[PDB]
Design a protein around this ligand. Structure first.
Ligand SMILES: [Ca+2]
Ligand SMILES: [Ca+2]
Ligand SMILES: [Ca+2]
Ligand SMILES: [Ca+2]
Ligand SMILES: [Ca+2]
Ligand SMILES: [Ca+2]
Lengths: 123, 129, 123, 129, 123, 129
């Protein structure tokens, strides 16, 4: 059951937002937007397609954050020469996932950067 | 000591190659240079700057990323297993080129910082032995 | 003749709309927006330049439908081994033509997809 | 039966190739490879399932499009000769890569549905004899 | 000490505008805005990230003009056979530089084309 | 005479090639074809018409750019010394592909106008001797 401004798809409420924010802020914003509020999670291709067209219908051609962050930070980074990774020199701290409203394809963008977003909750 | 055309730095030899190879192909060319040679491993600040200096002094074109030996082990598009809502990441739809799990150096950062790039890119590189 | 909001070019009226619709719906919306109303049809490069400029001036950086659809449905699809085409599992029914307000190059997209548009009518 | 590498299915032999080629060249490989072999022809749902199972089972990077042998015969950009307002399509300004007149399978659609893609892409493929 | 609604970065005032204009007109507009006013200029990656961010936060996903024009007009154009460059048949007279609010990469576009823009001035 | 396959026009020989090479390569192939041959140099409207004519009549694929011999000599991102505010350009962050310093012909302008394109593109060409 969706508060008249949030849209419904399979028992969930979704809503796109205009003000560009970094990933962190956007995630935290969604939480304060509703009980159980979070940045959009795609559990299927059909949910993805719903959100994408919703986003386009609401704010046109732009880019929006999904609820996936620090994507590679926890991976197993190894120097091919088996040297211990001690010294670090990362240009960008961590990458987050976003989608462009033209399709449901997943793309990465540095989390500190701006993008619009879609929040969702269960109710 | 070092072979002709290779620069020494703290007990190692380095050589910049201006060939446009993918990460795996670049690593392969290093491995063919010597038993023990691989793409460069930046392990300290002084080494970072030596390499940075090597690149700007030897490469005729600084318009690309130069591959270094750091990358993700495995065939994983991302290592975060959960969405911010708790859910598990089962479904995914990545563009292959968006998984930037290989690293390189670039002019924007003076070849001192490591950048996340798609491993399938064709870039020049540095070998260390 | 051009009413309020419609722009004239060589005895034709054009007007960009921002409500995202799929191709079928965009075309129909155009038809009931004025007699002879249709989806913009490009018959020269200057005409395309005009429309593209119009589209960018009015709505900025986006994607817009053009009056061409089911682009390859009537094509001669043949198997390389000369097998008989009977079974077919196209993931997408049809593809329609759209332009990006960035340039006048034609691009293809699944007709059921969202996109903004420009209507056009003569005289 | 078949040759080593090629799997049988209802009187035919199929083989998935992880050489990333262009449609014209993928078809070329298949012809060089066997008794009048070609890019796979999906002629039934059973075959659709077979090829999908084959692709996933024998392939490393399932994050690309995999060529099948169906494409538009004849160099045409679009086949619809009329605009919605009855005019004849004369002037065209297609981006050559925007004419997706070749077909391939992809992960999203479980390698069972055919997607329209530009013939110039470089993708893996499946042959059939 | 930037005017009402202009942003500040290292002693400079910046402001993105929504009305699309070609390069020349956007540059003139910027001059008529304040003394020492011109189309934005990048001197470092920091300033670039600042402006790209401002542009995104203000107008979303779009393309904006930079204060660099006629990029190749004064270059040494030569025919590989050393023929005299007497006859001309250029499609477009000059190319100008712009960025896309998704990042700080430099791109080129014919100067007669529309694009949004960011003005910059000092003090 | 001219070589076989080369059409003459005002005491010179021309020939369209449907190979897809980069400007630098296309120029090399042209040199190898005949003594003193290079990429076409259009010095008059009539020559512009002839080359356009020859292209549309002798080319199988007309949806790409066909290289001509006019380009910027060497490593040049931009030749404008400074920004509109008077300050000199030091820091630059171009995209390699955005430096459109080579020129080619296109169908949209009926192969009669010179369009700026990245020199690393692979397109057909017309040689002149
Ligand atoms: Ca969900
Ligand atoms: Ca080392
Ligand atoms: Ca028309
Ligand atoms: Ca078959
Ligand atoms: Ca500045
Ligand atoms: Ca000549």
């Amino acid at each position: 059951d969706c508060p008249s401004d949030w849209s419904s798809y399979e028992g969930h409420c979704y809503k796109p937002f205009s003000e560009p924010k970094n990933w962190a802020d956007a995630e935290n914003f969604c939480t304060q937007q509703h009980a159980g509020g979070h940045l959009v999670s795609f559990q299927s291709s059909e949910e993805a397609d719903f959100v994408v067209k919703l986003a386009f219908q609401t704010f046109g051609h732009s880019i929006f954050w999904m609820g996936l962050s620090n994507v590679w930070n926890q991976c197993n980074w190894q120097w091919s020469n088996a040297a211990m990774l001690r010294y670090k020199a990362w240009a960008e701290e961590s990458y987050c996932v976003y989608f462009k409203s033209t399709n449901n394809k997943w793309r990465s963008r540095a989390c500190r950067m701006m993008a619009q977003f879609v929040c969702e909750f269960q109710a | 000591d070092c072979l002709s055309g290779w620069s020494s730095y703290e007990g190692h030899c380095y050589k910049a190659f201006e060939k446009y190879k993918t990460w795996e192909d670049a690593e392969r060319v290093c491995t063919e240079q010597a038993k023990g040679a691989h793409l460069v491993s930046i392990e300290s600040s002084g080494e970072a700057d030596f390499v940075a200096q090597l690149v700007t002094q030897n490469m005729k074109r600084l318009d690309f990323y130069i591959w270094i030996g750091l990358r993700v082990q495995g065939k994983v598009k991302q290592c975060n297993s959960e969405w911010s809502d708790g859910s598990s990441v089962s479904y995914e739809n990545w563009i292959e080129a968006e998984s930037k799990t290989c690293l390189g150096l670039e002019k924007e950062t003076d070849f001192r910082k490591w950048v996340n790039i798609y491993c399938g890119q064709q870039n020049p590189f540095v070998c260390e032995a």
